[PDB]
Ligand binder design. Structure first.
Ligand code: HEM
Ligand code: NA
Length: 250
């Protein structure tokens, strides 16, 4: 009951569905689901409840936000999706990029995340610096996900499982390597690899490792490594909340 979703026209809803189908095809065909999940997450994860600035309001289309260090390479994702966007002028960029994130999780075998349309495209990007720093630890994760975004510790650990997809690139973040051996499959392998420690051919960031040493995060890592169904359930809830930060709040 924390949300009151807006009424959109039948034509808006039809555009959502037709765009969803185009996104499902393109994301699968171009093998770019991890990049598209990162696009949606960096779009949403800048929300700060104290000022109600940032969040999933389409500002990743703005070159000034694409230029943030944390968003290196997301210009590729914006450009890859623009041909579809041009077919759906009614949709906000805000909705479109969150829909791409939901689709990215779906097409890689993850949970079906509910999608509610109606986000506005806001004119001002957030200030740079809201997103989590991969070199920092649990206090920082709680500042970013908790104090800024309003999400729970469970949400932090579940959402960190987004790293079950994809990899780091030396020219984007400067880190390099995949967390999992199957980076196009949405599964609980991220947590299994965290528990088994560092190993040749796979990467762990300091922020991933902070989940292992924190007394509240660690039980959640253990749970998701053992129980993919529980991971999917908690991930679905956390991604839904993330994708709607600042949007439709009652
Ligand atoms: C918990 C704090 C987090 C930190 C410090 C962090 C940091 C990073 C870094 C440094 C990269 C490498 C980017 C590159 O070089 O291409 C990355 C990639 C990625 N992140 Fe995160 N991330 C966090 C949370 C999340 C969340 C919440 C999600 C989504 C639910 C997510 C999804 C991804 C994905 C899918 C990739 C791979 C992108 C690709 O393959 O192109 N991350 N993250
Ligand atoms: Na995986």
């Amino acid at each position: 009951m924390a949300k009151s979703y807006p009424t959109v026209s039948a034509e808006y809803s039809e555009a959502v569905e037709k765009a969803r189908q185009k996104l499902r095809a393109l994301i699968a065909e171009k093998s770019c689901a991890p990049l598209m999940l990162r696009l949606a997450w960096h779009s949403a994860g800048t929300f700060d409840v104290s000022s109600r600035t940032g969040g999933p309001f389409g500002t990743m289309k703005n070159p000034a936000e694409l230029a943030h260090g944390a968003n290196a390479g997301l210009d590729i994702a914006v450009r890859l999706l623009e041909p579809i966007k041009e077919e759906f002028p009614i949709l906000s960029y805000a909705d479109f990029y969150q829909l791409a994130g939901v689709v990215a999780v779906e097409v890689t075998g993850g949970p079906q995340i509910p999608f509610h349309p109606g986000r506005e495209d806001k004119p001002q990007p957030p200030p740079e610096g809201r997103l989590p720093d991969a070199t920092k630890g649990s206090d920082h994760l709680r500042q970013v996900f908790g104090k800024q975004m309003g999400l729970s510790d469970q949400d932090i650990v579940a959402l960190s499982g987004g790293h079950t997809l994809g990899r780091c690139h030396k020219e984007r973040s400067g880190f390099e390597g995949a967390w999992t051996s199957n980076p196009l499959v949405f599964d609980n392998s991220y947590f299994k690899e965290l528990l088994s420690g560092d190993k040749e051919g796979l990467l762990q960031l300091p922020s991933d490792k902070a989940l292992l040493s924190d007394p509240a995060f660690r039980p959640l890592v253990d749970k998701y490594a053992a129980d993919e169904k529980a991971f999917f359930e908690d991930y679905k809830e956390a991604h839904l909340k993330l994708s709607e930060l600042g949007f439709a709040d009652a």
